[PDB]
């Protein structure tokens, strides 16, 4: 409703870096808010794409940002009569970023890995890897839970069980309030997808440079499966956390699996031990239900609600014709021990091929009426197809079915405006939570500042 579309702030990165592919707010030990920005194709040392991360101080005029530097060098370790290798070319550093406390977590889902032993090898595969930084102290750590030292022959003999070689750890990511990092790994267990969790504190204290294979014992991975419903389901494509079981001591996980069950799609809610609490099935095959998931209480009853985006949902139209426009589903959490039901609300896109629901961002309470609100992106939507972000206000009954405000992409065609979104933080300290929108295709980020209701 009250985001200002007249005076925006633009941050920019190098051409072709895909600056804006992922972003998040970051507070330093003093509570000063900055913006961390991923740029998955930033040029590395050998003039080869490795991705990169930028830490933008807040300034109304915006501009350029300093790098958050990480080691971009391939590594080799000859140990235990084996040769360990990390490959960082085209690893996509910054394909995801998240901030928790004074710590930043940036992931390279396509970092490759291999182990050699005589004439055998594990195979060079994209295990993915995450880099952790404490900007104010210069501390650095890594987390790469899918790295292994088993040779090919073994996987083949065991029928490819517990095969974490194509994890792509960090494809998505989130951190619990308590500081547990939860990585999505859509390629885990031969493309079923798995989740890797470990306390940030333990990642730092157990990491040393040059080891490559080390134990983080407090870590916890999800499980393999023989159930075909899960094959190629990309469980972990998206991830989020929230409270869904009534017990404030336990934290629950929300995992997107957009191709679950032969591309029907699904999203699941789990306890911290990866036991399934609820499962929500997609509505239409190939709609990519679970592409994005968002958690926030929208009807002010203190119970977290779930939103799921299916950006390729095809809406039914006159004369038995379907039109791809994308859709978002709202599930309100019921009182006491009960299972989520049919969605309470369906939001459907309008622009053909617009991909409404590609990203969903909690805004907190934008107009300060006591109900939390959301922003939904349609990266190729709008009458011009340049991209749109639509705001929906919370209400006692859920969400308003019509957008209170629409933000049209200020960038040129192909910018993918809205592909990444983040709200619920007051960056300029005027008492109203603000919105940042990535346009990786244009290598830029836009900041919308919330203002008093007109």
């Amino acid at each position, epitope marked *: 409703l009250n985001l200002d579309p007249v005076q925006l702030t633009f941050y920019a990165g190098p051409n072709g870096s895909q600056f804006g592919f992922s972003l998040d707010f970051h507070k330093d030990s003093h509570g000063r808010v900055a913006i961390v920005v991923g740029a998955p194709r930033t040029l590395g040392p050998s003039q080869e794409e490795t991705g990169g991360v930028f830490l933008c101080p807040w300034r109304a005029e915006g501009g350029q940002c300093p790098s958050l530097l990480f080691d971009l060098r391939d590594e080799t*370790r*000859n*140990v*235990g*009569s084996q040769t360990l290798q990390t490959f960082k070319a085209r690893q996509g550093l910054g394909a995801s970023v998240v901030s928790w406390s004074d710590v930043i977590v940036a992931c390279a889902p396509w970092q490759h890995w291999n182990v050699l032993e005589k004439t055998e090898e594990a195979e060079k595969t994209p295990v993915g890897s995450c880099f952790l930084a404490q900007p104010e102290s210069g501390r650095r750590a890594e987390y790469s839970p899918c790295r292994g*030292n088993t040779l090919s022959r*073994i996987y083949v003999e065991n029928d490819f069980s517990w095969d974490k070689r194509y994890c792509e750890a960090g494809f998505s990511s989130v951190v619990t309030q308590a500081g547990e990092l939860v990585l999505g790994a859509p390629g885990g267990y031969y493309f079923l997808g798995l989740l890797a969790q470990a306390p940030v504190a333990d990642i730092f*204290s*157990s*990491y*040393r440079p*040059g*080891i490559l*294979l*080390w*134990h*983080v*014992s407090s870590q916890s991975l999800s499980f393999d499966s023989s159930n075909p419903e899960y094959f190629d389901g990309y469980w972990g494509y998206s991830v989020a956390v929230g409270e869904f079981d009534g017990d404030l001591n336990t934290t629950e996980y929300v995992v997107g699996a957009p191709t679950w069950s032969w591309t029907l799609g699904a999203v699941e809610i789990l306890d911290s031990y990866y036991q399934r609490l609820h499962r929500l099935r997609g509505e239409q095959m190939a709609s990519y239900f679970g592409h994005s998931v968002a958690v926030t209480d929208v009807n002010g009853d203190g119970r977290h609600d779930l939103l799921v985006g299916a950006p390729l949902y095809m809406e039914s139209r006159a004369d038995r014709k379907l039109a791809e426009v994308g859709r978002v589903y709202l599930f309100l959490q019921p009182r006491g021990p009960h299972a989520l039901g049919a969605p309470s609300l369906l939001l459907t896109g309008t622009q053909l091929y617009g991909r409404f629901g590609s990203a969903i961002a909690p805004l907190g309470d934008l107009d300060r009426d006591g109900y939390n609100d959301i922003a939904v992106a349609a990266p190729y939507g709008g009458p011009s197809g340049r991209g749109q972000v639509l705001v929906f206000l919370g209400q006692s009954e859920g969400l308003r079915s019509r957008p209170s405000q629409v933000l049209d992409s200020p960038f040129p065609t192909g910018s993918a405006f809205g592909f990444s979104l983040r709200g619920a933080v007051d960056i300029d300290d005027n008492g109203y939570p603000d919105l940042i929108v990535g346009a990786y295709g244009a290598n830029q980020v836009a900041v919308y500042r919330a203002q008093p209701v007109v």
Partner: antibody
Amino acid sequence: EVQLQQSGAELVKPGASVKLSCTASGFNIKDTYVHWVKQRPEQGLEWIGRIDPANGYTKYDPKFQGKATITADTSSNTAYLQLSSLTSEDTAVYYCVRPLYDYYAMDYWGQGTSVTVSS
Amino acid sequence: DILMTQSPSSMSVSLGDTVSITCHASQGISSNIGWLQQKPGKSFMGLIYYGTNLVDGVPSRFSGSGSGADYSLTISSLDSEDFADYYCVQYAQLPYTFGGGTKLEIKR
């Protein structure tokens, strides 16, 4: 806390066999590699071999091939070392070892189990 | 098998001393070394892994250094408990192999 409780001292006759045990305490035996090391006063420290309790795959020093047999039962969080055709030279102290962080390291040690072969 | 030559076999030093134990390998092991301690009539305790990294709980007066095939353990300001047996171990290759060991003894 990580503790490796090894079985009690063994006193066996030559030509016999014995099976030492090493039980993980405060953690899951399946977490890391588990190694066995032999110590003698004069000869010093010798690496016997390791097992990966997660899957049962073992490695040995060819010197101990046919003599030592390393196994593990995740169910009881315990690892074992079986010695056969015991002789007077097999008389020594035996340790189970695991790494702290580094996959290949030797950081944590059991208290040790003495083995005496005599008629 | 990689040969680990640990010198000296023993040294008679005093408290507060700063001593150094060297370890020589038959070939390059690129920091894939560990240092161990065995207090008299007791089990082993880990000191260092990967050449220079302190095991959790070990005092910082212990330090590790070296590269290629030559590495050193160095204790600054010896304590009364520091009088014991010290061994090195290489895990660059299987089989893992150990050093002859070194025994710190009180000087009088």
